[PDB]
């Protein structure tokens, strides 16, 4: 669908829950998808540092 | 109302739209028409068809009455509406005076229609010229021409279109009295003129005659190849 | 033909019959004669029915157009003005006896329109052929600022006078009540006269008629 911003939120939440449930390389992959996803959003106003 | 004088005089005394329109007449397909003593023979050259699709709609030889046939050159659009008005006018003559229309009278209608059309407002003049061939009452075959200024003008022979001055130079250098002895001999003179025209690879002619009593009659391209065959044969033995 | 209307204490009540009688022959039994003008203005027609129809389409088209331009509620004197301006121009050749009624911002307003252009505001009007009998009812039993049920009673009885006293009148009574906020158009208010039921069953069957040629063409 149309949105891009919530994709960063759900990839970040996956990166929370895989490492929080001890899945380090898949948490690295979901975090990486949050990086290359987050590369194109004009306004990450607080989700920038939340990702950081 | 679009009232605007278009035809204006030049500072040296000329009419620019007229002299430009005669150039547009001077690039159309060449038509040659001659008169006999009993049978007139006129025809167009440079059909320039696609030679695979329809051809009856591109006919440029009409009849205004039974005794008057008409050829032309120029742009095709302006001609046929003048033909339309000429048909209403010539039928209107029979609504008047009981006789069929004389070719002098209908050419005065054409030229007189054309001049005031050059005289009015907001109108470019016509871009056509015509050869009007008529066999009147008492069987006197004659023809005329029509300048884009609107001057009716009789002849013994005439030729207009693209490449017409050299064709007229052929017609003065070939028109005799004994050429109008036989009718097909005059037809051989016409095919001699179109052969003395330009290229015209065989299939590039549309002729039509009248025996001063019949309607117009167009030969299918078999007497074209036949008369061209005896013409090339006569020139072949003459050479 | 009998059309009538009245202004009660809050709104306007309109009533008519449903008869179109071609000469002395009953053509229609369900001829609606009350017509839309606006959501607050209706009209009742009389005389040449097609002239009333093509008039009332035109003017209500002009008020749909004009009110659609202004973006607000129309007024009764606007349609009154348009009609009395045009019928004077058509010089009485267009036959249309009209009852104009509507409740605008200023309130209820009623007019009677004559085909030459003369108009007037009155609290009650009767137009049509049997308008005399209904005018006798309104004159005998009129009272200002009556309630709407007394109005429906008086208008219904007034139409009923022309029903049982006029030759070219008498069918179901059409009514409409207009207030500042309520619009009640209703055709079958009452059935004063019915048809008797048939006694001899005259049913013919298939084959009692000689047919020369039959033709069938299928459809889809």
């Amino acid at each position: 669908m149309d949105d891009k911003a919530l994709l960063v939120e759900v990839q970040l939440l996956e990166s929370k829950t895989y490492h929080a449930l001890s899945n380090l390389p898949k948490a690295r992959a979901a975090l990486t998808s949050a990086r290359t996803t987050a590369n194109a959003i004009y306004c990450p106003p607080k989700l920038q540092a939340t990702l950081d | 109302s679009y009232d605007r004088a278009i035809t204006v005089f030049s500072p040296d005394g000329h009419l620019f739209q007229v002299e430009y329109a005669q150039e547009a007449v001077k690039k159309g397909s060449t038509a040659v028409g001659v008169r006999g003593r009993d049978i007139v023979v006129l025809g167009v050259e440079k059909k320039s068809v696609a030679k695979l699709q329809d051809e009856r709609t591109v006919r440029k030889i009409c009849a205004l009455d039974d005794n008057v046939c008409m050829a032309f050159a120029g742009l095709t659009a302006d001609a046929r509406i003048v033909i339309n008005r000429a048909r209403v006018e010539c039928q209107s003559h029979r609504l008047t005076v009981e006789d069929p229309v004389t070719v002098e009278y209908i050419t005065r209608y054409i030229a007189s229609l054309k001049q005031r059309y050059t005289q009015s407002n907001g109108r470019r003049p016509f871009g056509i010229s015509a050869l009007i061939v008529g066999f009147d009452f008492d069987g006197t075959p004659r023809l005329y021409q029509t300048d884009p200024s609107g001057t009716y003008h009789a002849w013994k022979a005439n030729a207009i279109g693209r490449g017409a001055k050299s064709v007229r130079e052929f017609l003065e250098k070939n028109y005799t009295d004994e050429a109008i002895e036989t009718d097909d001999l005059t037809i051989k003179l016409v095919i001699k003129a179109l052969l003395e025209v330009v290229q015209s690879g065989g299939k590039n002619i549309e002729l039509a005659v009248m025996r001063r009593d019949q309607s117009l009659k167009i030969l299918n391209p078999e007497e074209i190849e036949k008369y061209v065959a005896e013409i090339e044969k006569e020139k072949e033995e003459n050479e | 033909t009998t059309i009538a209307g009245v202004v009660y204490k809050d709104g306007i009540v309109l009533g008519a019959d449903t008869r179109a009688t071609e000469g002395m022959v009953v053509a229609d039994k369900n001829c609606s004669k009350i017509h839309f003008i606006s959501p607050n203005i209706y009209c009742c027609g009389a005389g040449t029915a097609a002239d009333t129809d093509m008039t009332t389409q035109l003017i209500s088209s002009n008020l749909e157009l004009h009110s659609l331009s202004t973006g607000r509620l129309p007024r009764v004197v606007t349609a009154n003005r348009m009609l009395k301006q045009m019928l004077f121009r058509y010089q009485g050749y267009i036959g249309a006896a009209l009852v104009l009624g509507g409740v605008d911002v200023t309130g209820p307003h009623l007019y009677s329109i004559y085909p030459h252009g003369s108009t007037d505001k009155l609290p009650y009007v009767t137009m049509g052929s049997g308008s005399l009998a209904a005018m006798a009812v309104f004159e005998d039993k009129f009272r200002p600022d009556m309630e709407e049920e007394e109005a429906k009673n008086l208008v219904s009885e007034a139409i009923a006078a022309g029903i049982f006293n006029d030759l070219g009148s008498g069918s179901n009574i059409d009514l409409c009540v207009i207030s500042k906020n309520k619009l009640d158009f209703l055709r079958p208010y009452t059935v004063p006269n019915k048809k008797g039921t048939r006694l001899g069953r005259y049913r013919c069957e298939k084959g009692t008629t000689a047919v020369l040629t039959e033709k069938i063409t299928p459809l889809e």
Binding site: - | - | T70, R75, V77, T78, N80, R81, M82, Q85, V105
Partner: protein, 240 residues
């Protein structure tokens, strides 16, 4: 930016603009005049100035206020020759409303019609599109007062405060600071705030002879023009 006769007639520029009307907006500014109209809670005030440079001239004939209808007043800026003709059009079409309809025309309807007429001149490429502006007031039922301004471009809008002319931008910059405090406005408050707009933007501190004020108020809906005596009363009322 320019191609062809777009500098001369009312057609479109290569930028999509058209230069003729925006040339005609500063034709109002060649008049050398600025008018202010302020709408009240139940009233509407029009104040403008006038410049009579000659004692040989009659100061009773320099009025830019015009009573269009019995309850409709307007003021004209721009040029006088186009303005008086526009006043003639407004009076005529208002009378035509009263004949076609039998009641009083609403002021937004009238200004809509005048804007429609002004659309035609810029809509064609033939006529000179009337380099003068238009300001009207009106008391309307279930709307109270309301103020409208029609430009020569055929645009119009309802205003709450109004300035037009030479000091128009600065006067509107004053009036937006006047209105952004959102004070409830009585009659003499709208008079005082109306005079202190041009009295401070123009900064004249004039005597009551060089201005004129038309007004309408819910009480008496007749548009009326003040006498210099009561103008002096509001002027010394302005001086505390």
């Amino acid at each position: 930016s320019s191609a062809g006769f777009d500098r001369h007639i009312t057609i479109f520029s290569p930028e999509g603009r058209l230069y003729q009307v925006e040339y005609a907006f500063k034709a109002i500014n060649q008049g050398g005049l600025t008018s202010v109209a302020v709408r009240g809670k139940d009233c509407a005030v029009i104040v403008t100035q006038k410049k009579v440079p000659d004692k040989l001239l009659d100061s009773s004939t320099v009025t830019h206020l015009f009573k269009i209808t019995e309850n409709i007043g307007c003021v004209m800026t721009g040029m006088t020759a186009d303005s008086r003709s526009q006043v003639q059009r407004a009076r005529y079409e208002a009378a035509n409303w009263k004949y076609k309809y039998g009641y009083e025309i609403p002021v937004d309807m009238l200004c809509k019609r005048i804007a429609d007429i002004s659309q035609v001149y810029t809509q064609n490429a033939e006529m000179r599109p009337l380099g003068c502006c238009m300001i009207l007031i009106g008391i309307d039922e279930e709307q109270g007062p309301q103020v409208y301004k029609c430009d020569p471009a055929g645009y119009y809008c309802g205003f709450k405060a109004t300035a037009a002319g030479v000091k128009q931008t600065e006067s509107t910059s004053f009036l937006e600071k006047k209105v952004k405090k959102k004070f409830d406005w009585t009659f003499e408050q709208t008079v005082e705030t109306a005079i202190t707009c041009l009295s401070t933007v123009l900064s004249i501190d004039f005597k009551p002879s060089e201005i004129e004020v038309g007004v309408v108020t819910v009480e008496n809906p007749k548009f009326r023009i003040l006498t210099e005596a009561e103008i002096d009363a509001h002027l010394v009322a302005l001086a505390e």
